[PDB]
Short mmCIF file of C-alpha atoms and ligand atoms in Angstrom, two decimals:
data_model
loop_
_atom_site.label_atom_id
_atom_site.label_comp_id
_atom_site.label_asym_id
_atom_site.label_seq_id
_atom_site.Cartn_x
_atom_site.Cartn_y
_atom_site.Cartn_z
CA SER O 2 -8.32 21.98 -32.41
CA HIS O 3 -10.75 21.39 -29.48
CA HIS O 4 -10.76 23.60 -26.29
CA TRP O 5 -12.82 21.56 -23.82
CA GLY O 6 -12.36 21.54 -20.03
CA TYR O 7 -14.26 21.66 -16.70
CA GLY O 8 -15.06 25.40 -16.38
CA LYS O 9 -18.43 27.25 -16.79
CA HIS O 10 -17.47 28.17 -20.37
CA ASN O 11 -15.94 24.88 -21.64
CA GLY O 12 -17.26 22.22 -19.21
CA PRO O 13 -19.45 19.12 -19.58
CA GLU O 14 -22.65 21.08 -20.46
CA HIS O 15 -20.83 22.43 -23.60
CA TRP O 16 -19.15 19.23 -24.82
CA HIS O 17 -22.11 18.07 -27.02
CA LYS O 18 -21.51 20.96 -29.50
CA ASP O 19 -18.11 19.56 -30.68
CA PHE O 20 -18.86 15.93 -29.58
CA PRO O 21 -22.56 15.17 -30.27
CA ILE O 22 -22.12 11.56 -28.88
CA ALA O 23 -22.16 13.38 -25.47
CA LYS O 24 -25.98 12.87 -25.67
CA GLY O 25 -25.65 9.21 -26.81
CA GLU O 26 -27.17 5.96 -25.54
CA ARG O 27 -24.17 4.58 -23.57
CA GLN O 28 -22.48 7.58 -21.91
CA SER O 29 -20.38 7.44 -18.71
CA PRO O 30 -20.20 7.93 -15.83
CA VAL O 31 -23.51 6.79 -14.25
CA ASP O 32 -25.01 6.55 -10.79
CA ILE O 33 -24.76 2.97 -9.51
CA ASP O 34 -28.07 2.20 -7.77
CA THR O 35 -26.90 -0.67 -5.51
CA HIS O 36 -30.52 -1.85 -5.02
CA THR O 37 -31.28 -2.24 -8.79
CA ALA O 38 -27.86 -3.73 -9.80
CA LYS O 39 -28.33 -7.50 -10.09
CA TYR O 40 -25.90 -10.20 -8.97
CA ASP O 41 -24.83 -12.10 -12.09
CA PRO O 42 -23.58 -15.63 -11.27
CA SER O 43 -22.37 -15.91 -14.95
CA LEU O 44 -19.51 -13.37 -14.34
CA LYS O 45 -16.06 -15.13 -14.30
CA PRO O 46 -13.85 -14.24 -11.28
CA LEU O 47 -11.70 -10.99 -12.42
CA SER O 48 -7.94 -11.40 -13.11
CA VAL O 49 -5.63 -8.38 -12.51
CA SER O 50 -2.13 -9.48 -13.70
CA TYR O 51 0.20 -6.49 -13.02
CA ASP O 52 3.40 -8.41 -11.93
CA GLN O 53 5.36 -7.37 -15.11
CA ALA O 54 3.87 -3.82 -15.39
CA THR O 55 6.44 -1.34 -16.81
CA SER O 56 5.61 2.31 -16.01
CA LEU O 57 7.51 4.88 -18.11
CA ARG O 58 6.38 8.47 -17.58
CA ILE O 59 3.90 10.82 -15.91
CA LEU O 60 2.31 13.66 -17.96
CA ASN O 61 0.13 16.66 -17.03
CA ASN O 62 -2.18 16.80 -20.11
CA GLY O 63 -4.10 19.92 -18.92
CA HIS O 64 -7.14 17.81 -17.85
CA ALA O 65 -5.55 15.31 -15.40
CA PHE O 66 -2.19 13.54 -15.16
CA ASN O 67 -1.52 10.18 -16.81
CA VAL O 68 0.93 7.53 -15.61
CA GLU O 69 1.87 5.81 -18.88
CA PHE O 70 2.91 2.15 -19.29
CA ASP O 71 4.85 0.16 -21.90
CA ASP O 72 1.98 -1.62 -23.72
CA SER O 73 4.23 -3.08 -26.53
CA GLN O 74 3.71 -6.61 -24.99
CA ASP O 75 1.23 -8.30 -22.55
CA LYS O 76 3.12 -7.02 -19.44
CA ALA O 77 0.14 -5.80 -17.37
CA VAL O 78 -3.28 -7.19 -18.33
CA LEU O 79 -6.89 -7.43 -17.16
CA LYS O 80 -8.91 -10.57 -17.99
CA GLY O 81 -11.99 -12.41 -16.70
CA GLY O 82 -15.03 -10.78 -15.11
CA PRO O 83 -17.30 -9.57 -17.94
CA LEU O 84 -14.36 -9.51 -20.42
CA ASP O 85 -13.67 -11.79 -23.40
CA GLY O 86 -9.91 -12.11 -24.05
CA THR O 87 -7.03 -9.92 -22.90
CA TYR O 88 -6.90 -6.18 -22.18
CA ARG O 89 -3.50 -4.46 -21.87
CA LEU O 90 -2.85 -1.62 -19.36
CA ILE O 91 -1.85 1.61 -21.19
CA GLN O 92 -2.28 4.35 -18.51
CA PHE O 93 -3.94 5.34 -15.29
CA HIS O 94 -5.23 8.71 -14.13
CA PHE O 95 -7.57 10.21 -11.52
CA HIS O 96 -10.52 12.61 -11.28
CA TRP O 97 -10.87 14.65 -8.08
CA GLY O 98 -12.67 17.53 -6.44
CA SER O 99 -11.99 20.95 -4.91
CA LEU O 100 -13.24 19.48 -1.55
CA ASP O 101 -13.53 15.92 -0.17
CA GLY O 102 -17.36 15.74 -0.80
CA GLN O 103 -16.99 15.58 -4.61
CA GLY O 104 -14.55 14.37 -7.26
CA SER O 105 -15.65 10.89 -8.34
CA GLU O 106 -17.31 10.40 -11.74
CA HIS O 107 -19.33 7.32 -10.85
CA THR O 108 -21.57 7.69 -7.80
CA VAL O 109 -22.97 4.95 -5.53
CA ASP O 110 -26.61 5.59 -4.49
CA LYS O 111 -25.80 9.27 -5.39
CA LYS O 112 -22.75 9.28 -3.02
CA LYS O 113 -19.77 11.17 -4.49
CA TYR O 114 -16.29 10.06 -3.39
CA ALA O 115 -13.30 12.43 -3.04
CA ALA O 116 -11.67 11.01 -6.20
CA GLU O 117 -11.73 8.11 -8.68
CA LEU O 118 -8.80 6.17 -10.18
CA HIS O 119 -9.15 4.89 -13.77
CA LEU O 120 -6.82 2.11 -14.98
CA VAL O 121 -7.27 2.09 -18.78
CA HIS O 122 -6.82 -1.13 -20.80
CA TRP O 123 -7.30 -1.95 -24.50
CA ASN O 124 -8.49 -5.19 -26.13
CA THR O 125 -5.43 -6.84 -27.72
CA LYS O 126 -7.62 -8.41 -30.51
CA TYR O 127 -7.64 -4.88 -32.12
CA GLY O 128 -3.82 -4.58 -32.19
CA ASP O 129 -3.48 -0.92 -30.98
CA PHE O 130 -5.31 1.55 -28.73
CA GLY O 131 -6.39 3.79 -31.64
CA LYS O 132 -8.18 0.85 -33.34
CA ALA O 133 -9.63 -0.39 -30.02
CA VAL O 134 -11.42 2.95 -29.26
CA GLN O 135 -13.40 2.48 -32.54
CA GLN O 136 -14.95 -0.78 -31.21
CA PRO O 137 -17.83 -1.26 -28.74
CA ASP O 138 -15.67 -3.76 -26.73
CA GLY O 139 -12.36 -1.93 -27.34
CA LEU O 140 -11.50 -0.73 -23.79
CA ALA O 141 -11.87 -1.90 -20.21
CA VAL O 142 -11.54 0.74 -17.50
CA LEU O 143 -11.09 -0.41 -13.91
CA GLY O 144 -12.51 2.31 -11.64
CA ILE O 145 -11.55 2.59 -7.97
CA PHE O 146 -13.05 5.12 -5.53
CA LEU O 147 -10.86 7.16 -3.17
CA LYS O 148 -12.09 8.26 0.26
CA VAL O 149 -10.14 10.47 2.65
CA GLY O 150 -8.82 8.78 5.79
CA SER O 151 -5.51 6.91 6.29
CA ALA O 152 -2.68 7.48 3.74
CA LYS O 153 -2.27 5.02 0.83
CA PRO O 154 1.45 4.11 0.97
CA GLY O 155 1.44 2.93 -2.69
CA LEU O 156 0.14 6.36 -3.85
CA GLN O 157 2.95 8.44 -2.23
CA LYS O 158 5.46 8.04 -5.16
CA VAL O 159 2.77 9.58 -7.42
CA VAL O 160 2.08 12.44 -4.91
CA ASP O 161 5.81 13.23 -4.60
CA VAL O 162 6.39 13.69 -8.42
CA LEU O 163 3.42 16.12 -8.90
CA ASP O 164 5.57 19.22 -7.97
CA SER O 165 7.65 18.43 -11.16
CA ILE O 166 4.58 18.34 -13.52
CA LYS O 167 2.61 21.31 -12.13
CA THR O 168 1.53 22.71 -15.54
CA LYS O 169 0.02 21.44 -18.81
CA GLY O 170 2.51 19.67 -21.10
CA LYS O 171 5.09 18.92 -18.37
CA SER O 172 6.21 15.28 -18.01
CA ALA O 173 8.69 13.40 -15.79
CA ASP O 174 10.35 9.95 -15.97
CA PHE O 175 8.19 7.55 -13.82
CA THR O 176 9.76 4.10 -14.08
CA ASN O 177 9.38 1.18 -11.65
CA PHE O 178 5.95 2.22 -10.28
CA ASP O 179 3.84 -0.78 -9.11
CA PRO O 180 0.10 -0.21 -9.77
CA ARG O 181 -0.75 -3.20 -7.49
CA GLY O 182 -0.19 -0.73 -4.59
CA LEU O 183 -3.33 1.22 -5.66
CA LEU O 184 -5.82 -1.70 -5.38
CA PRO O 185 -8.16 -2.37 -2.43
CA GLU O 186 -8.27 -5.86 -0.77
CA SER O 187 -11.53 -6.97 -2.50
CA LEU O 188 -12.05 -7.22 -6.29
CA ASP O 189 -15.91 -7.24 -5.92
CA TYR O 190 -17.26 -5.02 -8.74
CA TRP O 191 -20.14 -3.57 -10.72
CA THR O 192 -19.98 -3.60 -14.54
CA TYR O 193 -21.88 -1.89 -17.38
CA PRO O 194 -21.24 -0.81 -20.98
CA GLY O 195 -20.30 2.86 -21.37
CA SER O 196 -18.00 5.49 -22.76
CA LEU O 197 -14.91 7.56 -22.24
CA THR O 198 -15.84 10.24 -19.65
CA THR O 199 -13.91 12.99 -21.53
CA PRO O 200 -13.98 14.06 -25.18
CA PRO O 201 -14.07 12.33 -27.58
CA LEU O 202 -16.66 10.45 -25.37
CA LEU O 203 -16.44 7.31 -27.56
CA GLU O 204 -18.78 4.44 -26.63
CA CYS O 205 -16.03 1.81 -26.46
CA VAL O 206 -15.70 1.00 -22.72
CA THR O 207 -16.62 -1.94 -20.52
CA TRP O 208 -16.63 -0.29 -17.08
CA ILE O 209 -15.55 -2.37 -14.06
CA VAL O 210 -16.05 -0.29 -10.88
CA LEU O 211 -14.75 -1.83 -7.64
CA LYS O 212 -17.13 -1.73 -4.64
CA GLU O 213 -14.35 -1.24 -2.03
CA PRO O 214 -12.81 2.26 -2.02
CA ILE O 215 -9.14 2.85 -1.19
CA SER O 216 -8.28 5.28 1.63
CA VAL O 217 -5.89 8.18 0.91
CA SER O 218 -4.87 10.95 3.31
CA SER O 219 -6.13 14.57 3.22
CA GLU O 220 -2.46 15.56 2.59
CA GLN O 221 -2.26 13.24 -0.48
CA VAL O 222 -5.44 14.65 -2.14
CA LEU O 223 -4.44 18.25 -1.21
CA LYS O 224 -1.30 17.72 -3.37
CA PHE O 225 -3.49 16.67 -6.36
CA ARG O 226 -5.31 20.02 -5.95
CA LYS O 227 -2.02 22.02 -6.34
CA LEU O 228 -1.69 20.91 -10.00
CA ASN O 229 -2.64 23.40 -12.72
CA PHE O 230 -4.87 23.09 -15.81
CA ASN O 231 -2.87 25.98 -17.38
CA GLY O 232 0.55 25.95 -19.03
CA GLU O 233 3.74 27.45 -17.53
CA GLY O 234 3.61 31.26 -17.18
CA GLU O 235 -0.21 31.42 -17.77
CA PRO O 236 -2.72 32.62 -15.14
CA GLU O 237 -3.05 29.88 -12.49
CA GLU O 238 -6.18 27.69 -12.78
CA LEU O 239 -6.00 24.96 -10.10
CA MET O 240 -6.63 21.43 -11.45
CA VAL O 241 -9.74 20.59 -9.37
CA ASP O 242 -13.23 19.30 -10.17
CA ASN O 243 -12.02 17.46 -13.33
CA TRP O 244 -15.03 15.08 -13.20
CA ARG O 245 -18.04 14.65 -15.49
CA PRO O 246 -21.38 14.26 -13.68
CA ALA O 247 -23.52 11.11 -13.92
CA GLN O 248 -25.24 10.61 -17.31
CA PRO O 249 -28.59 8.94 -18.15
CA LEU O 250 -28.53 5.13 -17.75
CA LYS O 251 -30.98 4.73 -20.71
CA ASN O 252 -31.39 1.05 -21.77
CA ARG O 253 -28.57 -0.37 -19.62
CA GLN O 254 -28.30 -2.79 -16.72
CA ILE O 255 -25.52 -2.66 -14.11
CA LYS O 256 -24.42 -6.15 -13.00
CA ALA O 257 -22.81 -7.01 -9.63
CA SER O 258 -20.09 -9.67 -9.22
CA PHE O 259 -21.19 -10.25 -5.58
CA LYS O 260 -24.36 -10.87 -3.52
C1 Q6A U 301 -9.75 8.91 -31.16
O1 Q6A U 301 -10.07 8.52 -29.83
C2 Q6A U 301 -9.08 8.79 -28.89
C3 Q6A U 301 -7.85 9.34 -29.18
C4 Q6A U 301 -6.95 9.56 -28.15
C5 Q6A U 301 -7.23 9.25 -26.85
C6 Q6A U 301 -6.19 9.59 -25.88
C7 Q6A U 301 -6.06 9.34 -24.56
C8 Q6A U 301 -4.93 9.92 -23.86
C9 Q6A U 301 -5.20 11.27 -23.28
O2 Q6A U 301 -3.88 9.30 -23.73
C10 Q6A U 301 -6.91 8.52 -23.71
O3 Q6A U 301 -6.45 7.48 -23.28
N1 Q6A U 301 -8.09 9.12 -23.39
C11 Q6A U 301 -8.94 8.70 -22.34
C12 Q6A U 301 -9.95 9.57 -21.97
C13 Q6A U 301 -10.81 9.24 -20.95
C14 Q6A U 301 -10.68 8.03 -20.27
S1 Q6A U 301 -11.77 7.59 -18.95
N2 Q6A U 301 -11.86 8.91 -17.98
O4 Q6A U 301 -13.04 7.33 -19.58
O5 Q6A U 301 -11.09 6.54 -18.26
C15 Q6A U 301 -9.69 7.14 -20.68
C16 Q6A U 301 -8.83 7.49 -21.69
C17 Q6A U 301 -8.47 8.71 -26.58
C18 Q6A U 301 -9.38 8.47 -27.60
NA1 NA U 302 1.00 -3.41 -29.73
ZN1 ZN U 303 -10.99 8.86 -16.29
#
């Protein structure tokens, strides 16, 4: 079994030994150079259709926490933008820092945000998530930056359940959560082909990173930082700095939906 994490001894600089694709040609995240990203008038609008989203459960997996959805039908889907066909929401999670000046995976002109939300979707032409991750167009991840300022009201139900999933392997029922409450006003975005940002680092993702961050309060992000990487009864390792740094862009172009 693999034993990867975010520490000195098991962090991103070590991942290539068990996961050689870590040094591949389409790794994520990347720095978004806003001056070199080109407006693409060919991009179709972006369609976030979350009205029928069915959340089920929240899980501390020892790396982050996942809010899991019922993806047995087209209940919550992402379409349009750079995407061909229909991508079904399966889970969302965050990456965050030990302090407000770091935590995001993507950077914008080298700026790090306090955290980054990833809404993970799979291409329904491949029938299940496990088949989709084996395809270069298998996943679409919608990335949203978090900055610290005013509270995000739609985030508070997530913040309030974290005390019940403090340690690795703990889960709690998490029904009737509306992910529309985590979006900013604007759907302007950057897009590029990349990878999962954690092992197994598969090169199966179309990244869609929104330009407009959401604001969350200091109190909300402080509660993320009280989670634990460790299991119950084990020495406490606070769940902080669960982000991979920017990877080489190589032969890729970042496209902007906006001028
Ligand atoms: C054989 O391949 C795989 C087998 C299982 C999984 C399992 C997942 C879990 C934990 O449910 C999963 O969804 N992983 C995931 C990791 C990073 C991102 S991210 N940061 O790039 O958005 C998004 C999603 C993934 C691949
Ligand atoms: Na299915
Ligand atoms: Zn992620």
